[PDB]
Amino acid sequence: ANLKEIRAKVASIKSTQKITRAMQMVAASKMRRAQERMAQGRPYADNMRRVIAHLVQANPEYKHRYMVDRPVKRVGYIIVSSDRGLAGGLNINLFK
């Protein structure tokens, strides 16, 4: 039979395997970069919650429409997803 084609298929699969290995390493670097990126946003929210709490404890005489809760008729929803798939089933179970 056409055995050489079979060997070629094997070689292509080997190449694909190495490419996947590269995919994984690049993903790891991106993971570390984003994981770093998360921490930088803390102090903003930290201090800002601090001062908002200082305000409300200084002024409990009224509230804000974002501080208030009335019975719900409709809701808005905000969902964040990738531009390209292949990253697990995060979109899948998210949608579920």
Partner: protein, 138 residues
């Protein structure tokens, strides 16, 4: 003496350190800041900010929107958007990182689909004709 000043945006901080003079464009009054000053908060004009260390030098940061909080020992700005810069002319500089990250966003796709979708596409493609001829005796 001096006192801590923290130039922080949502993404990250811009400048930090202990300083003794500051110039800032408030929602109402223009404000000069000195250590120990009475605690104050206000909204800020989307303009540049000048801050003066005791070394005879004064930094500049260009800010677009944001709020200022001050304590007698710590002062900071929650920046809507700020850049270590002298003037809005430095807009020619923020777009540099903007398009850099844009190019990276192009790159991630230019590799992802090209690497993954392609190779994985050819992988399972012609395998069937093999799996069907496994036990061939002739």
């Amino acid at each position: 003496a001096t006192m801590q000043c923290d130039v922080v945006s949502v993404k990250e901080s811009i400048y930090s350190g202990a300083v003794t003079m500051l110039i800032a464009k408030g929602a109402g009054g223009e404000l000069g800041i000195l250590p120990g000053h009475a605690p104050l908060v206000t909204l800020l004009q989307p303009g540049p900010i000048r801050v003066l260390l005791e070394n005879g030098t004064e930094e500049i940061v260009y800010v677009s929107g944001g709020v200022l909080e001050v304590q007698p020992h710590v002062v900071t700005v929650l920046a809507d958007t700020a850049i270590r810069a002298d003037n809005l002319d430095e807009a020619a500089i923020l777009e540099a990182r903007k398009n850099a990250e844009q190019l990276l966003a192009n790159q991630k796709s230019d590799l992802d689909s090209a690497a993954a979708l392609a190779a994985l596409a050819e992988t399972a493609a012609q395998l069937e004709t093999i799996r069907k001829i496994k036990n061939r005796a002739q």
